Design a protein around this motif. Structure first.
Motif, short mmCIF file in Angstrom:
data_model
loop_
_atom_site.label_atom_id
_atom_site.label_comp_id
_atom_site.label_asym_id
_atom_site.label_seq_id
_atom_site.Cartn_x
_atom_site.Cartn_y
_atom_site.Cartn_z
N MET A 7 8.59 -7.73 -3.42
CA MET A 7 8.73 -6.99 -1.97
C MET A 7 10.24 -7.05 -1.67
O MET A 7 10.76 -7.95 -1.85
CB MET A 7 7.83 -7.74 -0.99
CG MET A 7 6.76 -7.07 -0.40
SD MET A 7 5.32 -7.87 0.56
CE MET A 7 6.08 -7.92 2.06
N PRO A 48 2.22 -15.69 1.90
CA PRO A 48 1.02 -15.53 0.84
C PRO A 48 1.66 -14.47 -0.35
O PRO A 48 2.50 -13.70 -0.33
CB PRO A 48 -0.16 -15.14 1.64
CG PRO A 48 0.57 -14.53 2.81
CD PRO A 48 1.63 -15.31 3.16
N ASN A 97 0.69 -1.07 9.57
CA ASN A 97 -0.85 -1.35 9.37
C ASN A 97 -1.03 -2.75 10.29
O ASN A 97 -2.16 -2.98 10.25
CB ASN A 97 -1.67 -1.28 8.23
CG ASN A 97 -0.84 -2.13 7.05
OD1 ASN A 97 -0.65 -3.31 7.18
ND2 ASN A 97 -0.49 -1.36 6.16
N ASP A 151 0.93 -1.23 -0.02
CA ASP A 151 0.20 0.01 0.08
C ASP A 151 0.95 1.45 -0.06
O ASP A 151 0.45 2.34 -0.14
CB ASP A 151 -0.72 -0.15 1.08
CG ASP A 151 -2.12 1.11 1.21
OD1 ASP A 151 -2.23 1.45 0.16
OD2 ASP A 151 -2.47 1.48 1.97
N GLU A 163 10.77 -14.71 2.90
CA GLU A 163 10.93 -15.87 2.46
C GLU A 163 12.16 -16.89 2.78
O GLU A 163 12.07 -18.01 3.33
CB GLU A 163 11.12 -15.90 0.93
CG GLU A 163 9.76 -15.40 0.18
CD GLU A 163 9.13 -14.44 0.47
OE1 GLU A 163 9.80 -13.58 0.19
OE2 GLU A 163 7.99 -14.21 0.56
N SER A 174 -0.45 -5.53 9.31
CA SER A 174 -0.79 -6.73 8.54
C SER A 174 -0.39 -6.58 7.14
O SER A 174 0.23 -5.47 6.54
CB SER A 174 -2.22 -6.95 8.37
OG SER A 174 -3.09 -5.86 7.75
N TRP A 175 -0.67 -7.74 6.35
CA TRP A 175 -0.30 -7.75 4.85
C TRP A 175 -1.70 -7.04 4.30
O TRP A 175 -2.28 -7.85 3.81
CB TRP A 175 0.03 -9.09 4.48
CG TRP A 175 1.50 -9.54 4.75
CD1 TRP A 175 2.49 -8.74 4.98
CD2 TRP A 175 1.54 -11.00 5.17
NE1 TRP A 175 3.58 -9.56 5.24
CE2 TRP A 175 3.23 -10.84 5.44
CE3 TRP A 175 0.98 -11.99 5.47
CZ2 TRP A 175 4.09 -12.03 5.91
CZ3 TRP A 175 1.75 -13.05 5.51
CH2 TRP A 175 3.17 -13.23 6.14
N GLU A 176 -1.90 -5.66 4.46
CA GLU A 176 -3.22 -5.25 4.17
C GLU A 176 -3.38 -5.45 2.43
O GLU A 176 -4.63 -5.62 2.37
CB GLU A 176 -3.11 -3.79 4.32
CG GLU A 176 -4.61 -3.21 4.22
CD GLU A 176 -5.39 -3.89 5.14
OE1 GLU A 176 -5.24 -4.41 6.33
OE2 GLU A 176 -6.49 -3.98 4.60
N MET A 177 -2.45 -5.37 1.69
CA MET A 177 -2.80 -5.47 0.34
C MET A 177 -3.35 -6.84 -0.04
O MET A 177 -4.23 -7.12 -0.93
CB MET A 177 -1.60 -5.11 -0.59
CG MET A 177 -1.92 -4.32 -1.71
SD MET A 177 -0.65 -4.08 -3.07
CE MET A 177 -1.50 -5.20 -4.16
N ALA A 213 6.45 -6.44 -8.59
CA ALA A 213 6.00 -6.80 -7.20
C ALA A 213 6.80 -7.34 -6.23
O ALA A 213 6.39 -8.01 -5.26
CB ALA A 213 4.63 -7.41 -7.34
N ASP A 248 5.09 -2.36 6.98
CA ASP A 248 5.52 -2.94 7.98
C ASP A 248 5.85 -4.44 7.66
O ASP A 248 7.07 -4.99 7.75
CB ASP A 248 4.52 -3.34 9.12
CG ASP A 248 3.17 -3.68 8.69
OD1 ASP A 248 2.64 -2.88 7.61
OD2 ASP A 248 2.73 -4.62 9.12
N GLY A 249 5.18 -5.16 6.74
CA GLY A 249 5.59 -6.39 6.23
C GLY A 249 6.68 -6.59 5.21
O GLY A 249 7.24 -7.59 5.33
N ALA A 250 7.08 -5.53 4.69
CA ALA A 250 8.19 -5.47 3.74
C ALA A 250 9.37 -4.94 4.60
O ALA A 250 10.65 -5.29 4.48
CB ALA A 250 8.02 -4.45 2.65
C1 LIG Z 1 9.28 -11.15 -1.77
C2 LIG Z 1 7.63 -10.99 -1.76
N1 LIG Z 1 6.96 -11.73 -0.61
C3 LIG Z 1 5.72 -11.91 -0.56
C4 LIG Z 1 4.94 -11.05 -1.62
C5 LIG Z 1 3.29 -11.09 -1.52
C6 LIG Z 1 2.68 -9.75 -1.16
C7 LIG Z 1 2.14 -8.97 -2.31
S1 LIG Z 1 1.52 -7.62 -1.07
C8 LIG Z 1 1.90 -8.06 0.42
C9 LIG Z 1 1.60 -7.48 1.84
C10 LIG Z 1 2.49 -6.47 2.15
O1 LIG Z 1 2.56 -5.74 3.46
P1 LIG Z 1 3.24 -4.39 3.65
O2 LIG Z 1 3.25 -4.22 5.30
O3 LIG Z 1 4.47 -4.47 3.08
O4 LIG Z 1 2.32 -3.14 3.13
P2 LIG Z 1 0.54 -3.30 3.31
O5 LIG Z 1 0.30 -4.48 2.16
O6 LIG Z 1 -0.13 -2.17 2.96
O7 LIG Z 1 0.36 -3.73 4.69
C11 LIG Z 1 2.48 -9.34 0.22
C12 LIG Z 1 3.07 -10.24 1.34
C13 LIG Z 1 5.52 -10.21 -2.68
N2 LIG Z 1 4.94 -9.30 -3.39
N3 LIG Z 1 7.10 -10.29 -2.50
#
Ligand SMILES: Cc1ncc(Cc2csc(CCOP(=O)(O)OP(=O)(O)O)c2C)c(N)n1
Ligand SMILES: Cc1ncc(Cc2csc(CCOP(=O)(O)OP(=O)(O)O)c2C)c(N)n1
Ligand SMILES: Cc1ncc(Cc2csc(CCOP(=O)(O)OP(=O)(O)O)c2C)c(N)n1
Ligand SMILES: [Mg+2]
Ligand SMILES: [Mg+2]
Ligand SMILES: [Mg+2]
Lengths: 530, 523, 530, 141
Positions: A396, B23, A448, A374, B48, A450-453, A394, A421-423
């Motif tokens: 991450m 995921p 957020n 996001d 990962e 979580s893995w909001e997207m 995409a 946060d997730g990244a």
């Molecule tokens: C290397 C890799 N592993 C998993 C994923 C799969 C994924 C696509 S979008 C997403 C959620 C990202 O959470 P973030 O905290 O970063 O921002 P937000 O969604 O708004 O909460 C994931 C896990 C991808 N695209 N690349």
């Protein structure tokens, strides 16, 4: 001249600016000549993924060759993914992986590392012959340039110091005089005969630094100009600037139709795929579509081989009478501004306002490095000086690493990073290297929880709920200044501070609630229902 | 019954204990089933690699199957490394990658690090394919690859069968056994090395019985470490090359009838190198085969070979248990001196001698591993051959998940912790409280010992302890040996949160083992 | 099913008819399953070069897959040249080379054999995985078929007997509905708009057995039809038969111009090069030239990929209204006849007369196998039932071997061979295998005591003078009936005899004097002066 | 064969390593204790000196060894088959060797021999020559 040196000089001779990497047994001798020679600045990162991601950016930034140096084995493989996205996005990252000497003959898997990289690069070569090394290097390097994609170079250690002759220039690639002409002819003919010819500007344009001449064309052509994602920005200060950017569904439905419904859609140096914003082949009339990409042009279902974009352009001008025409006409562009400095909880869009306001108040625009999630969809609505994210890939993890690599070559400019946060849990730690690297990028964590997207697409699923990592409180360990914010006040306030504080990387932990998305991410979802 | 469901079940029947994954668009549909059917526990991580290491550890822990669930593209790729090292060390990590719809190259890469792959794009075939792939993973004990199109996660499929039997050339088995045994008996100084395959296929008992009947000197490899220690004829130590005890190293390398039972050949540090032994007089049983000088019997799974030999050897009561094949460093002088690896080992070993129960240890790459080698453990997981960093933390995590209550110890260098160390932020949700001893020498010391002249091996000061807090754990930094002893004690008394002990170590101080290693390269 | 078997059956399932080859250490186990199974007739030759040359012909003859089986090392390399000409001429020779077991790991050169064949084939594969073998075989085989060129198959010996599942059908190749249509459209459009459109028939036509449908096209098209060399013969008994054959300079200057001066020159399945008779790209208007070849069509400088000739044709008919038209109109063709049975010394042309006369007297036409040299240029003027020579390759040695391979599958028919002294010294000895093979080909040795074709170009040079090898007197050793002739009488007389004598190969040693050439070879030379 | 293969200090001076019939195989020797000098290099167990043309290596060693008069010429390292019984029996390889060797013993001058692949080579091996050219490793006819 030592072999390893002959190489680095070559990279330098081609506009190289640094050499990111992590050493290992087999790679030490090469890092040694990298260090001792001092040819290219040697920046080292914590994890291989950032090594490749930074090289990626250092490459995209200056639009030149990036440099990822790794050791044999886990080192290389642990960076495979970064190279893939670089490849996926025409980012010419020159990968260098020290290998066992030519007299130690045995591996550990049932070559292999070679076959894997053979899979994600355009050219490769094992420098096991000091005699052939020079031309070989010239070749491979010449390839990443001609095709603007990653290349693979393996250097057995007992070869890092073998005396070799210097590396010459890139090998001359094929170009047919007639063929070309015939191509332009048909291309221009196809354009002139179109109803709504739409010329799109994409990635290859920025890679071969052709913007200079394409602006001179966009003018002499006379047709509407639009940019793709990778193309966003180009021709901004040009006579006939783009009328907008194309990101598909989530974009200005006004721009959309114009593109998806053309009969003279000239995709200049454009990428083709169903990758979010990319121009999906499923959404256009393949019949009337000139597709210039990878030294080839394809329209009418047939193709023109060995047709460098440069040449295609150069010969297109030769057939277009100069013009004094110009379609500027006031109207800039409206970005989300005006932050309610109140104590109401943050939302993606609020942050946009935040940065934008600062900028309109007089702040020079910082180039932006955004990770996937996001944070990306939110970064689209921010005033920048160059955006840099994995839209067509995409992958991450990019975010932070990328921003770092950037500021490492920015020659002064500062870099802004946005990441969820997730990244951040994946590569946000590469900031610990900010002290040694002497850079202080400003980072905006979108925590957020979580893995909001992923949750928006499967909200019934729980696994997308994450824990509350107290990042702001962790920024001290890596030697930065962290600050978690809950309200729009603590938000606007914190940012100002960050621009004032230099020398230490600034990390603003933005506390956002699940569900709350970005305007652009909103439009995107609503568009998958119908 | 859905397809995903069927895979998960098919997976659980063969030993599966959990599912580690992360995921993405294509994965989503698959994960929904997973989470719901609850066939296997769905443990998510952060990056990962971790997922790959965790899954890998899980498998090794229960000498069973591991399961990493990724998404197409960036997801699958960013995890190739873990799967490779897995492949290297014979750990059957079942890789499950979600992928594009069949109506809507990664496959080409994975084929390079898995002994079998498959794309279940046809529900009529799905049942058998699943049963084929897992099969190999079990037969050869190596990672396999399963790529699922999100539009097939729910497609009904006939239940998954049983593994498809593998070629077992009964005659060669019997002929080999004869050649083998004779080859042994007839050798001046024959030796028996027990390795990796003996553990994976839970053959400890048999090989324990054989060890006695065959009546020859016994030795383990690095991955064979800890086997047959309770058998009448225990190993005389662990061979790891020049590094370790030179009496065991001389014996192994001088043997004129060496029997590598389920071992791995490779010039790769601790792996039994081909340049160190007399291959002409070697009997290397591996990957369901047996070699010995201008001869290779194919289709002879280790297991059956033992049985063969046992059928050719009379029972025995020949027990030869002596004392300490290896003296474990003890007596930590808790003074104010700075800290050193061997001290950490003592600190650790003493608690044990004091009566504490030995935990299983997970180690990353770096001196932390060489140090773990002088510690008393109840299992040791580490990348002794592949030698790739990151494994440490996530592996200790992964282990503890399926260790039903048992606590795992983890030793990681600063260099390594910067890569995977942060996965500890999942400990809380994960219901784990692993103990971690971070070796912060502020450098990539293992390399400095190969290029002390270069300055890039110089790392900055990362206050890891100050960060433990932010991950829902307790993290303390210690500089002296006194502080070291006290802190380690607190950790063990504190369960509920993972414990991080940031031990600051001077650059230039190495573990004894590692010391020996470097000195052996000078010669 | 055993692996080696699974393969042979496959070859059979694809129209295979035999398996030529020479065994060696590593290849014995495979010859054993080849022999024991009896799937394919196993014919063995004396030297590897003939092994490949015969496979070549056994392939061209029936227009199917040829089969050359060799052992690792010298065996393979000693046959490289034969495969090259096969490749060079769209002759799908399936090469099979037994290799060391997968557990004997060490070579002898600093793979290699693999890289060399990788260089002269279209697809290759090392069958080292009994699981993957089936599809792999299907693949590679499927390739030689799709592309009509040599393929490489390596079979480690410890794998000749591994049980495997049977080999399925060829993997389905790419074909785009639209793309194709667009192609035909432009092709036909290009034709209709031409002044003198000239449709040429070549090699790919005879390989994919498309003559059946191309005749149905040559009719519905309405344009002039000419054949290339490889195409010579095709559409002979067709509604609109070719108006002649194109061999360039040395040919009917009438045909020449028509081709070299067209603006609708549709080169169907044709080869392009400066190889004597081949259509040199230097002699035609590349602008208006449709070039269908190797599943692709290129005209107007652009190309249509994955366009199987079959499809191109099939879709071309769909756009051409059926026709009842026909341009036959009497006039057959005039060949050199009338031999002066006097005692005057022989000349290339006399021999032509010789054979031709026999034929007009009532003799059924024998297919001809000619080696490179003045024997080829002389064979053009002989009435045949299929010619078979290395025109676009010039690989001496072909002659005899080829004829042999031919008669080995002729199912009865007899084969005629013409070859000069210099080439007979290379492979004329393969006749020794005629007894065991149960065939009696008639051979006409052109002993001019020199490398005459080379002498015409550098007559001041002596090295082209050879010795007088008494071949006719050597034919007894290999078990044949040899006969040296000095005059046209001993010539006509000897031939008659040869057709009467069956069971033993007939070798007629024709004594010709240096300088004396062939009419066609004459024209050819005169044409290099101006 | 036993001596060569049992040596614990084998010095292949300008030799070729290869599992290829007559070529000194790596599976037959104790490479750990081998000093294989070839292609301008020298190896010996986890060690390879590069850029050392054979020629100079000898000189090197000669500079490190004191002169000697240690001569050890004995008798026949290999007994050459002789005495061809010229009877009416059919012919056999070893007979050809004798036929050949006898002429020599009878005083004839040994010629240089060229051999192709096949038993003819193994036979040439029991003949007295003044040079022997043959594909003993490549083994190509
Ligand atoms: C290397 C890799 N592993 C998993 C994923 C799969 C994924 C696509 S979008 C997403 C959620 C990202 O959470 P973030 O905290 O970063 O921002 P937000 O969604 O708004 O909460 C994931 C896990 C991808 N695209 N690349
Ligand atoms: C994925 C990967 N990339 C690089 C390397 C190469 C390496 C082998 S050892 C070492 C230094 C490790 O420093 P650490 O703090 O972890 O422990 P210590 O040296 O005792 O201080 C490196 C970089 C490996 N093995 N794997
Ligand atoms: C494998 C190979 N090696 C050499 C050559 C070179 C050559 C082209 S033409 C020719 C003379 C052939 O003499 P021949 O007795 O056969 O017939 P004629 O010329 O009328 O006397 C040679 C040697 C070729 N093409 N291929
Ligand atoms: Mg988030
Ligand atoms: Mg360290
Ligand atoms: Mg001649």
């Amino acid at each position: 001249m030592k072999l390893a040196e002959a190489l680095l000089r070559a990279l330098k001779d081609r506009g190289a600016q640094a050499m990111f990497g992590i050493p290992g047994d087999f790679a030490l001798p090469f890092f040694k000549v990298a260090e001792e020679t001092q040819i290219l600045p040697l920046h080292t990162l914590s994890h291989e993924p950032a090594v490749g991601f930074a090289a990626d950016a250092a490459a995209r930034y200056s639009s030149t060759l990036g440099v990822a140096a790794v050791t044999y084995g886990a080192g290389a493989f642990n960076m495979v993914n970064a190279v893939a996205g670089a490849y996926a996005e025409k980012s010419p990252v020159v990968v260098i992986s020290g290998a066992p000497g030519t007299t130690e003959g045995n591996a550990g898997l049932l070559d292999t590392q070679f076959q894997v990289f053979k899979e994600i690069t355009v050219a490769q070569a094992r420098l096991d012959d000091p005699a052939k090394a020079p031309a070989e290097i010239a070749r491979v390097l010449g390839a990443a340039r001609a095709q603007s994609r990653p290349v693979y170079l393996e250097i057995p250690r007992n070869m890092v110091n073998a005396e070799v002759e210097p590396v010459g220039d890139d090998p001359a690639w094929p170009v047919d005089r007639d063929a070309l002409a015939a191509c332009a002819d048909e291309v221009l003919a196809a354009m002139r005969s179109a109803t709504s010819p739409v010329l799109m500007v994409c990635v290859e344009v920025r890679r071969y630094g052709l913007e200079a001449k394409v602006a001179e064309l966009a003018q002499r052509l006379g047709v509407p100009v639009v940019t793709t994602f990778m193309g966003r920005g180009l021709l901004a200060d040009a006579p006939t600037p783009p009328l907008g950017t194309y990101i598909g569904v989530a974009g200005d439905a006004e721009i959309t139709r114009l593109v998806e419904e053309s009969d003279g859609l000239f995709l200049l140096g454009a990428i083709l795929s169903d990758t979010n914003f990319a121009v999906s082949q499923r959404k256009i009339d393949l019949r009337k579509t000139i597709h210039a990409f990878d030294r080839a042009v394809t329209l009418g279902y047939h193709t023109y081989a060995d047709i460098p974009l440069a040449g295609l352009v150069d010969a297109l001008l030769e057939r277009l009478p100069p013009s004094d025409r110009t379609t500027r006409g006031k109207e800039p562009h409206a970005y989300p501004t005006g932050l309610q400095a109140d104590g109401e909880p943050i939302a993606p869009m609020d942050i946009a306002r935040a940065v934008n306001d600062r900028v309109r108040a007089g702040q020079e625009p910082l180039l932006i490095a955004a990770d996937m999630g996001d944070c990306l969809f939110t970064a689209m609505d921010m005033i920048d000086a160059g955006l840099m994210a994995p839209g067509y890939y995409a992958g991450m993890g990019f975010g932070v690493p990328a921003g770092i690599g950037a500021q490492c070559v920015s020659g002064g400019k500062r870099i802004l990073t946005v990441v969820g946060d997730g990244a951040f849990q994946m590569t946000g730690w590469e900031l610990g290297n900010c002290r040694r690297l002497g850079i202080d990028p400003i980072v905006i964590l979108f925590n957020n929880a979580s893995w909001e997207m992923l949750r928006t697409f499967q909200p019934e699923s729980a696994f997308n709920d994450l824990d509350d990592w107290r990042f702001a409180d962790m920024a001290a360990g890596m030697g930065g200044d962290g600050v978690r914010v809950r309200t729009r006040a603590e938000l606007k306030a914190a940012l100002d501070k960050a621009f004032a504080t230099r020398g230490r990387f600034q990390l603003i932990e933005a506390m956002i609630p699940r569900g709350v998305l970005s305007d652009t991410l909103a439009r995107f979802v609503q568009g998958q229902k119908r």
